[PDB]
Amino acid sequence: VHLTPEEKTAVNALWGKVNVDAVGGEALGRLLVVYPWTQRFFESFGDLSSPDAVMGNPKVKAHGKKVLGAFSDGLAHLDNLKGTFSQLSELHCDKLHVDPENFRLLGNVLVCVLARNFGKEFTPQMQAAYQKVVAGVANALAHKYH
Amino acid sequence: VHLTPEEKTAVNALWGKVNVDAVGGEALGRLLVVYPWTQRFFESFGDLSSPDAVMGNPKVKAHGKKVLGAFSDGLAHLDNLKGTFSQLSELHCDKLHVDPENFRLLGNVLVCVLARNFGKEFTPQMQAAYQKVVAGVANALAHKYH
Amino acid sequence: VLSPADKTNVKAAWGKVGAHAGEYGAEALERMFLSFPTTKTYFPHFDLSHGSAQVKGHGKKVADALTNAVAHVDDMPNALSALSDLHAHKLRVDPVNFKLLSHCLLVTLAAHLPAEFTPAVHASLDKFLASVSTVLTSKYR
Amino acid sequence: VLSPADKTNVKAAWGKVGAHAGEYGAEALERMFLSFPTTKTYFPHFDLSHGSAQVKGHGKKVADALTNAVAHVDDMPNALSALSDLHAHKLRVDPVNFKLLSHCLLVTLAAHLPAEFTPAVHASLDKFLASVSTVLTSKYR
Numbered sequence: 001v002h003l004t005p006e007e008k009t010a011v012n013a014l015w016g017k018v019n020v021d022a023v024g025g026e027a028l029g030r031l032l033v034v035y036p037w038t039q040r041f042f043e044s045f046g047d048l049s050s051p052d053a054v055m056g057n058p059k060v061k062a063h064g065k066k067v068l069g070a071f072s073d074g075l076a077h078l079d080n081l082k083g084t085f086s087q088l089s090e091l092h093c094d095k096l097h098v099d100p101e102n103f104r105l106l107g108n109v110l111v112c113v114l115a116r117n118f119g120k121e122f123t124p125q126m127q128a129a130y131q132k133v134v135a136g137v138a139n140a141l142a143h144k145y146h
Numbered sequence: 147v148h149l150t151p152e153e154k155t156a157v158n159a160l161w162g163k164v165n166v167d168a169v170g171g172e173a174l175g176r177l178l179v180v181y182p183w184t185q186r187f188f189e190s191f192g193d194l195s196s197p198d199a200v201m202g203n204p205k206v207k208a209h210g211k212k213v214l215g216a217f218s219d220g221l222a223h224l225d226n227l228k229g230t231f232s233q234l235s236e237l238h239c240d241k242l243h244v245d246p247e248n249f250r251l252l253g254n255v256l257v258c259v260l261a262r263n264f265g266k267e268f269t270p271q272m273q274a275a276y277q278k279v280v281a282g283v284a285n286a287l288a289h290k291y292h
Numbered sequence: 293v294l295s296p297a298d299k300t301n302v303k304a305a306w307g308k309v310g311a312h313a314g315e316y317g318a319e320a321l322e323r324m325f326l327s328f329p330t331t332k333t334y335f336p337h338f339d340l341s342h343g344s345a346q347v348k349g350h351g352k353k354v355a356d357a358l359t360n361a362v363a364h365v366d367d368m369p370n371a372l373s374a375l376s377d378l379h380a381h382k383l384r385v386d387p388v389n390f391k392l393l394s395h396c397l398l399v400t401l402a403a404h405l406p407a408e409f410t411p412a413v414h415a416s417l418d419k420f421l422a423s424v425s426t427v428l429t430s431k432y433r
Numbered sequence: 434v435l436s437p438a439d440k441t442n443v444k445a446a447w448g449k450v451g452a453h454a455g456e457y458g459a460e461a462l463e464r465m466f467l468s469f470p471t472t473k474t475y476f477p478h479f480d481l482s483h484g485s486a487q488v489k490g491h492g493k494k495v496a497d498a499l500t501n502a503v504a505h506v507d508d509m510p511n512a513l514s515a516l517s518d519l520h521a522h523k524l525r526v527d528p529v530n531f532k533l534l535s536h537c538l539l540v541t542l543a544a545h546l547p548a549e550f551t552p553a554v555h556a557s558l559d560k561f562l563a564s565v566s567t568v569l570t571s572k573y574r
């Protein structure tokens with residue numbers, strides 16, 4: 001993932017304002033809502049019967065927070081993404097059987113939360129940077145498949 | 147792409163019966179007919195205004211031979227695919243802008259064509275073996291995106 | 293979205309399939325389970341062995357479902373609502389799996405009906421299955 | 434397949450756009466051009482420079498097309514037969530690009546109308562935009 005000097009600085013700046021305790025949960029939540037079938041991988045999380053149940057579910061919030069954690073791990077090592085996500089890939093890929101297409105969906109859903117929580121500060125330029133970031137995380141997330 | 151010995155003799159045994167002057171044209175023609183939008187990348191080829199025109203098109207048949215060859219070339223280098231397919235990946239991804247999903251579709255159409263030209267011989271085991279190949283070829287061509 | 297011409301190739305096509313759909317449905321599954329191992333996690337307690345009686349009978353079911361889908365190719369959401377409830381509400385089946393199945397049914401069909409599986413019929417059958425996949429993988433009640 | 438609840442969310446949410454319908458269409462377009470550069474290959478002779486008038490104008494039509502889409506959300510194939518003729522027959526736009534713009538529209542909405550972008554409306558706008566994408570990438574004449 002190449003980010004020009006300006007991008008790297010603008011990316012981090014917004015990411016530093018990201019409510020590490022609410023955004024991860026809203027991203028995972030939304031993924032579960034907008035793309036229903038993804039719920040099948042989370043049958044142990046409890047209630048997911050309604051949009052309000054999903055967003056308000058404790059295990060969705062707690063886990064989503066771990067998800068953002070992984071993303072930040074990616075933001076800190078954009079040059080060693082495959083080594084950074086080698087552990088998570090074998091899990092999703094060979095242990096959980098998650099199809100790669102869902103990585104791209106979550107990556108995109110996060111971008112939407114970000115746009116919703118930051119508004120006009122999430123400029124088209126800012127978006128473009130985050131789109132290379134999410135693609136890189138998703139791509140590295142599927143390496144044990146390529 | 148890893149193939150157990152048995153598969154390697156079976157795959158290459160069926161492939162050795164492949165008419166090298168038609169199958170490629172059939173697979174490419176079918177892609178253009180089944181997934182219409184792929185015609186945009188071949189707009190100077192002339193008449194693609196109907197299935198018959200597409201399948202009969204001289205240039206579709208000619209280019210399809212070049213496509214099959216790249217596929218035969220892969221069957222010979224299943225251990226260095228991203229390497230062997232590096233130039234074409236550069237061509238298809240950076241110069242052409244062909245979304246990766248289309249590589250997957252072409253690989254499958256090739257399979258359908260194989261099933262159509264060989265019948266009972268194209269067994270579920272044979273297909274299974276061939277699916278690993280095409281996905282291997284599509285992944286290699288998509289590398290520039292990875 | 294299917295065209296009139298698409299609906300005509302579909303009906304005619306499935307027509308020759310006739311009493312062989314059932315069998316074409318079992319082969320498809322068998323091919324899907326072999327070439328795409330991960331699809332079996334949707335069938336844990338099944339007996340997915342080469343030629344299993346369970347695979348052939350279930351194949352028959354998917355087979356009749358498509359037959360029904362074709363007769364009602366104009367109002368499929370209403371006709372397939374029950375199976376929509378199953379794969380989308382209960383099984384929560386990832387849409388990628390349907391492409392795998394649709395593909396395997398095309399391969400199977402191409403293998404049995406060489407002359408009928410023209411490029412035109414191919415296209416149409418693909419659009420048809422894709423539309424069937426969308427209804428089964430959607431939550432619309 | 435859209436549910437009776439999906440249509441209801443879309444109608445509520447695309448109504449707040451009001452006069453900012455093609456201020457939002459221009460943004461999603463720019464967002465798309467900047468985020469996913471290959472999409473600009475569909476606009477060879479367009480001034481795609483930042484703040485271009487041609488992209489603004491083109492953003493208006495896009496937005497109005499969606500408004501007309503919302504209005505006939507239950508007869509889109511007929512409603513959007515012309516756009517289908519343009520994108521499917523004449524421009525042969527690869528399906529992946531509709532996913533890119535859709536996503537970019539979902540960003541212009543979450544940015545401009547946060548209180549509308551509830552999870553249920555998000556998921557409903559996504560399905561709705563996928564249905565419009567199918568209709569415009571399908572030849573159904």
Ligand code: HEM
Pocket residue numbers: 038039041042044066067070071088092096098102103104106107137138141
């Ligand atoms: C590309 C973005 C993604 C990232 C960065 C990510 C990251 C993670 C992390 C860090 C864990 C926890 C590791 C552990 O403690 O063992 C995890 C678990 C998991 N992820 Fe993901 N994930 C992503 C996408 C997905 C997608 C798309 C799905 C499929 C819907 C998925 C399904 C799961 C499941 C089922 C678990 C195990 C949950 C449990 O604890 O029961 N993930 N993920």
Ligand code: HEM
Pocket residue numbers: 184185187188209212213214216217234237238242244248249250252253283284287
């Ligand atoms: C995954 C299988 C594919 C293989 C093995 C393949 C192989 C080839 C080869 C060997 C060439 C020759 C270029 C050279 O001499 O360097 C070529 C050209 C080309 N391919 Fe592909 N290709 C594949 C898929 C696709 C797809 C899906 C598209 C998009 C619809 C596509 C579009 C093109 C175009 C536009 C050209 C240039 C044609 C021209 O001469 O004007 N290819 N391909």
Ligand code: HEM
Pocket residue numbers: 331334335353354355357358375378379383385389390391393421424425428
């Ligand atoms: C257009 C394609 C498909 C059709 C027409 C179809 C049809 C059916 C039908 C008719 C049933 C039986 C309902 C009953 O019990 O009466 C069924 C069950 C089932 N289907 Fe599908 N199906 C399709 C695709 C898929 C795919 C892609 C998967 C996942 C890989 C899948 C997984 C299942 C499962 C898990 C069951 C329940 C099996 C059991 O527990 O007995 N189906 N399907």
Ligand code: HEM
Pocket residue numbers: 472473475476494495498499516519520524526530531532534562565566569
């Ligand atoms: C929600 C999806 C979309 C809608 C509703 C839409 C709508 C429209 C409309 C209304 C026109 C104007 C034609 C006229 O009346 O003069 C148009 C033109 C066009 N669209 Fe789209 N479009 C969509 C997606 C796309 C996508 C994904 C692409 C590809 C990147 C694309 C490429 C074009 C092109 C190249 C033109 C012709 C532009 C020109 O030369 O004036 N559209 N579109």
Ligand SMILES: [C-]#N
Pocket residue numbers: 028067
């Ligand atoms: C991870 N979800």
Ligand SMILES: [C-]#N
Pocket residue numbers: 174209213
């Ligand atoms: C190559 N087509």
Ligand SMILES: [C-]#N
Pocket residue numbers: 321354
């Ligand atoms: C059921 N397949």
Ligand SMILES: [C-]#N
Pocket residue numbers: 462495
């Ligand atoms: C059309 N944009």
